[PDB]
């Protein structure tokens, strides 16, 4: 039941592109500088309405990297993982959106508070609390 769904590119504070790679069985997720005119991997953000307020109610979102896959957040392992799951999507697939300056967003786990998708050692992971830094396109 998303309200709207759009494709956007993902990129970090320092402008590394977040790329996905599916070896179709397992995968990889890269935070790395691309080559000029190399197209960027677009992911579907699907926007749902949290009762989390603002000013009002702020959105949450689920990101399909591609073709029936989403971003599952692995709690104890502080990791982001990819799942198939035709099934109605679970709570670790959801992220409260946040907005500070323009386009610059951070994703908080619907399940467990103060934990954001963020970046560590040039890999994508989960952060408990400027390293949660995402631009869209």
């Amino acid at each position: 039941s998303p309200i709207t769904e759009y494709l956007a590119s993902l990129s970090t504070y320092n402008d590394q592109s977040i790329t996905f790679a599916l070896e179709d069985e397992s995968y990889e997720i890269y935070v790395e500088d691309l080559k000029k005119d190399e197209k960027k991997d677009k992911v579907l953000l699907s926007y749902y309405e949290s009762q989390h307020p603002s000013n009002g109610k702020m959105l949450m979102v689920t990101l399909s990297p591609t073709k029936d896959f989403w971003l599952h957040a692995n709690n104890k392992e502080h990791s982001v993982e990819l799942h198939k799951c035709e099934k109605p999507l679970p709570d670790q697939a959801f992220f409260v959106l946040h907005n500070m300056h323009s386009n610059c967003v951070s994703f908080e786990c619907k399940t467990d508070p103060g934990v954001f998708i963020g970046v560590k050692d040039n890999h994508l992971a989960l952060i408990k609390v400027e390293n949660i830094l995402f631009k869209l396109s």
Binding site: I3, S26, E28, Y30, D33, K35, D37, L59, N99, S102
Partner: protein, 278 residues
């Protein structure tokens, strides 16, 4: 399987495509690679290092990460080039980056993370070393407050990767683009409707000054988009102001139309505002 590149005389580190941990254990191969210090080309963990790189080194370098609940394997397509005294970095290095006028100042030095650098670095716009007030470089990026449409250009940063105490030269170039207008945005605001009764309907909401990455106004019906007789049906439009609108359309009233809410919505990255009609 991911490509990588660089010039002769320059240090180049290359990360193994399939990722993993310290204590997970990675091997590399060319055409069975030194694990530490065959003094020029060798590999430390996920990092294939070339100190410095020569063109002869071009090739595919496969790597294998071993758990051993798995051996993941991934490759590096790699090419090293001869500097051509063109003075103009050819179109193959890195990738274009935009900014506002004074409104966004920041050019990051690509791939710098891969290397070991404790120093302040040098920047050059099209073979011209930057200097002075307007360009002020800090950490891994370059801040230009002056920015006109005039600062378009290929910025290249040189820095030094130090290995055991051996210093090597590395550079990277990317294009810089200036954003014409940089506008603001806030929580969406629905001019029409208010919360109200009707007894041809329309919704307009407004998201900020600039051009929005994400702005949408849309009609929901009983809190869903899709419950249908031949009508309802939805239609759009477009007009330094930035606001959007969406019109419902219903030709023939029926009875069902009395109960449940007709919900106009405007959403943004800031959040969602909804109004209710009846």
């Amino acid at each position: 399987s991911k490509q990588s590149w660089g010039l002769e005389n320059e240090a180049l580190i290359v990360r193994c495509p399939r990722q993993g941990k310290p204590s997970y254990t990675v091997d590399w191969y060319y055409s069975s690679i030194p694990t530490q210090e065959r003094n020029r080309v060798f590999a430390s963990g996920q990092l294939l290092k070339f100190l410095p790189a020569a063109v002869a080194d071009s090739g595919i370098y496969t790597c294998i990460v071993r758990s051993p609940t798995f051996n993941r394997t991934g490759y590096a397509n790699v090419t090293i080039y001869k500097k051509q005294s063109d003075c103009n970095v050819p179109d193959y290095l890195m990738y274009s980056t935009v900014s506002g006028s004074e409104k966004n100042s920041k050019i990051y030095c690509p791939t710098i993370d891969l290397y070991n650098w404790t120093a302040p670095l040098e920047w050059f716009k099209n073979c011209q070393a930057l200097q002075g007030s307007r360009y002020r470089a800090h950490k891994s990026f370059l801040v230009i407050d002056n920015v006109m449409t005039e600062d378009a250009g290929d910025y290249t940063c040189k820095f030094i990767h130090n290995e055991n105490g051996a210093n090597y030269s590395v550079t990277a170039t990317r294009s810089f683009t200036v954003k014409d207008e940089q506008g603001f945005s806030l929580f969406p605001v629905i001019g029409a409707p208010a919360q109200n009764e009707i007894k041809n309907l329309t919704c307009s909401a407004c998201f900020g000054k600039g051009t929005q990455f994400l702005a949408a106004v849309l009609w929901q019906l009983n809190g869903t988009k899709i419950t249908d007789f031949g009508e309802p049906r939805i239609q759009q439009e477009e007009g330094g102001l930035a606001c959007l609108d969406m019109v419902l359309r219903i030709a023939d009233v029926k009875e069902e139309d009395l109960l449940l809410q007709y919900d106009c919505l405007a959403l943004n990255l800031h959040g969602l505002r909804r109004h209710t009609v009846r």
